[PDB]
Structure 1
Amino acid sequence: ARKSLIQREKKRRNLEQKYHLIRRSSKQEIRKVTSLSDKWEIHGKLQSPPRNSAPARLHRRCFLTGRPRANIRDFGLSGHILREMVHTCLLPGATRSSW
C-alpha cells in the first residue's frame, strides 16, 4: 500500500524481463529429471545468480492502492477498491447477481 513497498516489488518485476526472458531456458534443461541416468550437478550447484530474482517472489498488488492480499487475476485490484469500482459504473459486465 506504501510507495516504498510497491517499488520494492517493481524492482522484482524489472529483472523478470532480463534474467527470466532468455537465460531461464539455459537452466531449465538440467534442473528437471532427465530420462537418462546422467544428470549434471554443475549447473544446479553454480545456481547462485537468482538471489533477488525469482518468479515466485512476484505479488500482483492493487493497481490503485497496492496491498498484497485478495488479488483477483481477472481484475488486478483488491476486494475493497474492486468493489468501489463496480458499485459505481467503472467496469463493463459487473452487475448485481442472484445465484
Structure 2
Amino acid sequence: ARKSLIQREKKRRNLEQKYHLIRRSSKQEIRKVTSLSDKWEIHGKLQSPPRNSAPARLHRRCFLTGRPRANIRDFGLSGHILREMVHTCLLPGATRSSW
C-alpha cells in the first residue's frame, strides 16, 4: 500500500512484542476468577493502557507489495503477486494442478 502503512504494521508489531507476554499473561490471571468474581473492575483499568498492543489491531499485509486484502496467509503474499512467484518457478511445489 502506501509507504506509511507498512510501518504502521511494523511499529504495531513492535508494540506487540513490547509487552505481549506481560499484558496477556496478566489477562491469564484476570480471567481466573476462582478466587473472586465481583472485584478487579479497576484492574481492567490496568488492562487499558496498552492501545496498539491489542493483537486484534495487528494485520498481516503482503510483505512484498502490501495489499491488505486477499493475503493467502500460508504464503504471506497477496493474490496477484502469488501468480508471478508461481509462474517464474519461484515457489517450490506449485505444480499448478488442474485435476
**TM-score over 0.5 (shorter chain):** yes
Deviation at 1:96, TM superposition (A): 1.7
Give the deviation of 1:33 after TM superposition.
5.3
Change (3 A) 1:51 1:93: same
- Preserved contact between residue 23 and residue 47 of structure 2 (Cα < 8 Å): no
TM-score w.r.t. the length of structure 1 is: 0.84
1:37–1:24 CA distance, 2 compared to 1 (3 A): closer
Following TM superposition, by how much is the alpha carbon of 1:35 offset from its aligned partner in structure 2, in angstroms? 8.0
How high is the sequence identity, in percent, across the aligned residues?
Answer: 100
Consecutive unaligned residues of structure 2, counting only runs of 5 or more, are none
More helix by share: 2
Shift of 1:42: 2.6
Contact 2:62 2:78 in 1 (8 A): yes
**Is 1:86 matched with 2:86?**
yes
Q: Is the 8 A contact 2:71 2:79 kept in 1?
A: yes
Q: What is the TM-score of this pair, normalised by structure 2?
A: 0.84
Aligned residue pairs total 99
Contact 1:31-1:44 within 8 A present in 2 as well: no
Shift of 1:47: 2.5
Measured on the aligned residues, the alpha-carbon RMSD in Å equals 2.1
Deviations 1:27-61 (A, max 9, x none): 22114654864553231233321222210111111
Q: Partners in 1 of 2:46 and 2:8 — Cα distance?
A: 26
Aligned counterparts of 1:90 and 1:20: Cα–Cα separation in 2: 35
- Check 1:64–1:41 CA distance in 2 against 1; reply closer, same or farther (3 A cut): same
Runs (4+) of structure 1 exceeding 6 A deviation are: none
